Subunit: 158 residues, 8 copies
């Protein structure tokens, strides 16, 4: 019943969206991958957001936009519930595209997360506050990560 | 049951920043607790504190506040079950480069980074709003109000 | 006759906008001053742009938004003709807000100019390609600037 | 009947120049591609600028120079009408060459644009304020970009 | 009987760890290599430190963590003796991960050294104030390095 | 019996030096405060280092130089034992003077610590491996700091 | 016999120029202070340079321009002998105007020096290769500096 | 007769050093290439400088050191006449090693030039103030660079 809308500005971002989606599927969380440009197809984005917003189910938007990221703040100020910004990595201007996701006005509150798997995890943990099944899944995932590190210590320690 | 936000800062010096976050949560009617604890200097105290909060049978978020190199947000985040939000205090040092210590988490550590204290409070409300209608109404009023003032600034001095 | 629409993201940008407006007036160019947020008042901004775009006259938009500038690319993607981005100055993250004005997607082409007086000049010089009166005022303005520097040197 | 003069500081810039040229051709806008150095061949540049400035037709200059960009300001202070700065991409010093294009004195007003297709698009949109054939070409272009995005979404 | 505990946050840091390990061995210094994350395995790390802190021998901790380095400060605040931070290299964000190792609070004092062999050299030179054999080993090492540069100049 | 030589490149660094000295006093550690430029008075520095190096007591050098720090590496390459770099703070070029302290060649291994009180603490903690009086002093210090934080929490 | 021409792009840099002049006066070196813009009064700059270039005496030019520095490259491309860029200090964009002075094309070789006093000193030291009176003056100046440091250490 | 002493902190710098040399050879200016570390071999660098400082000919030093450049200011604070700092390129920390060459104390005044061919050209142009042959060579050189550019346009 939770839904995560993965909304990217360009078809060029699809590979970054697919990393987020794969990880969401591991948590058993439903997702939808969509494309719209805040700069070029603003009204198409508004229409889309209106469609998803009308759904009576707990939702999150994870917004993906390279270069100067207008999409994440655009979606965040339109929709009611929480959103997550997860821009694709860039080395242009030594990663300075990140400030465009960071520097929001008062009243715009997307959660910024750099890594696609971590964006999925944050989504899961947001639902987990009220969804016991998803909390069980997160618990398993993080315990597994921790056990692997301890197992690496046991195996490789000298 | 009633949402709780634990606002956990690494130093009593962070109180100003924490109080900004707390005051904003109050306007959403969301209960908070403000606490102090250092990931560097008082690790076992933080762990003990977090076990106490985690045993509470209500939906919760942690907002974690640490200046300089932020070890606290990732530390809290890796220990607790639910989501957390990092909202570091502002700093000019090294043209603001302390932000990277909040951004650059390992795989499997997923705190939500938000810069402004009022926006950290906003995000916390919006997370709960997915399930809490009272908070969703409060959020809608707040956001719509923000929008109205801008439209009103335009009408009042557009020329 | 030309119109420059000066659209800013917040009322706090007013002093920056008036520096631009001030200078447009000296070029004999009509301007309008408006406020609208690309993040918080999207439909309102889309609704204002449609009104201006229906006007049968040569028009430019100058867009002013602090912090992460979404406004410039949002407006520029919506309107037909040219636009100019002129963000207010900031020292946040050693001026790193500038990259949000610089890094546009292919197909979004605002002209970035830093100084308010230079945004106005650029707007004047765009009209000047087709407006002889605006061309004369610009020739006058630019020669004055040059003559002052030469005079300054003359005292030395 | 507009003309865009693409002027680059080095023949090494030619790849970048041609990208701008190729795009202008799609808008049906005539262009010239020239080479000349603001630091090493100043009189060759000025002589060129004089010949272009004497043409009675609307014109823009797109100025391309790597490293510390003096060329865009040189051109812009010489010619009457608008100019556009479009420096080639560089990763030297985390891309800090961009600041030499940004940081103009008062009275020097080139339009900074990063992407060569957006420099072409901006020039088209500047002429579009008065050239209807061009306005039409821009509209078809921008609408095609928008429709492609919406098509990409449809597949999903 | 010095001991250097080489503690890294992930097995993906092992190649960097083995560089410090190798160099320490050249100085005759016993090491232990361990894995533990301050973010993900805080209580495991604590347990591990308490064990080493109970040893009555002179000890250093060299702490390795990529991205945002919480491990070095975490360890340093827990243990009584000196520690050394030696993060694995990175060009992400122009190397900005370094600040997470530099910016400690007052009362947290790990020694930051970039290069793994210099982290080993620092460790040695630390023990050398009281340990004559290590002091002789460091002497030989540093004098050789100097003699080689003088030798390179002599071939030229 | 431990000694710390605090060597600064200029009398204008004395404030920073004095912060380190005052803190060393609180750990019961003898210091010398000295002035010598690597760039301007290189032979004076060398002769001074020889005088201290001739002492058979365990010792550290804490080296202070603003701007491009050549002093830390110069001293570190000359002396046998460990040294600590503690540059004075600067916001010049957003703090980029720090790179001159970070970027040592292979075989130069000064401990970089930003804050003067943390430089003193590192020093104490280095001696604490073998000097139980100093370790007692460091235990008091760190435990007091931790207890104060926990006390601050208890008020909440 | 030598002459240093101090050429600034704007009268707003006068204070910076005077610091350079004051220091050159202590070396006994004649200077001229002038103003001319690379972007706005190129002909005027060329005319001035032609006048100084005719003088049969050893000369340097020290070129001062804030923001994006085109001036130093412009002068250096024009004049036969060496030049020194000494831009005014800015903290805008973390000091990134400095890259506009660094990033010269092949064939354009101004010597960059940050500090006004050090620009004066470099100038003196260039003429000193052939001028023994200026060499004697530099020797005294730099020996005064060293002795000041050595003297500061002897008290403190 | 001018002499340029090209002094590098390490043999790994030789590539950069040889680029400067090759250009100086085009001007007819004699060079020496030498190695010494300001960190590790300070008393050797100091003894080397004393040898060059004793030659009665106009001289410049071009100093080359990667990473945190202590060498340029070290040599500049010892020798009498002008020096030129020309560090090798590096992408580390977005090029931030450059600040170690820029940020000299008052009384230390090496000329910073980035490109090896430009360090050579600056060296030539310093000598050119008093050396007519070298002045001639520089006019030929700079006119040739401008001619090639104008030629590029003509094709």
């Amino acid at each position: 019943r939770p839904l995560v809308i993965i909304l990217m500005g360009s078809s060029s971002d699809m590979g970054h969206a697919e990393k987020i989606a794969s990880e969401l599927k591991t948590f058993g969380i439903e997702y939808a991958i969509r494309i719209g440009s805040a700069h070029k197809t603003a009204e198409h984005v508004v229409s889309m957001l209106k469609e998803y917003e009308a759904l009576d189910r707990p939702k999150l938007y994870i917004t993906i936009a390279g270069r100067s990221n207008a999409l994440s703040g655009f979606v965040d100020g339109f929709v009611k519930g929480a959103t997550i910004a997860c821009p694709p990595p860039s080395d242009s201007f030594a990663g300075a595209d990140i400030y465009s996701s960071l520097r929001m006005p008062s009243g715009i509150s997307p959660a910024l997360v750099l890594e696609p798997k971590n964006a999925a995890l944050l989504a899961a943990r947001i639902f987990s506050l009220y969804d016991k099944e998803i909390a069980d899944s997160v618990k398993s995932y993080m315990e597994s990560n921790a056990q692997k590190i301890i197992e690496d210590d046991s195996k490789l320690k000298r």
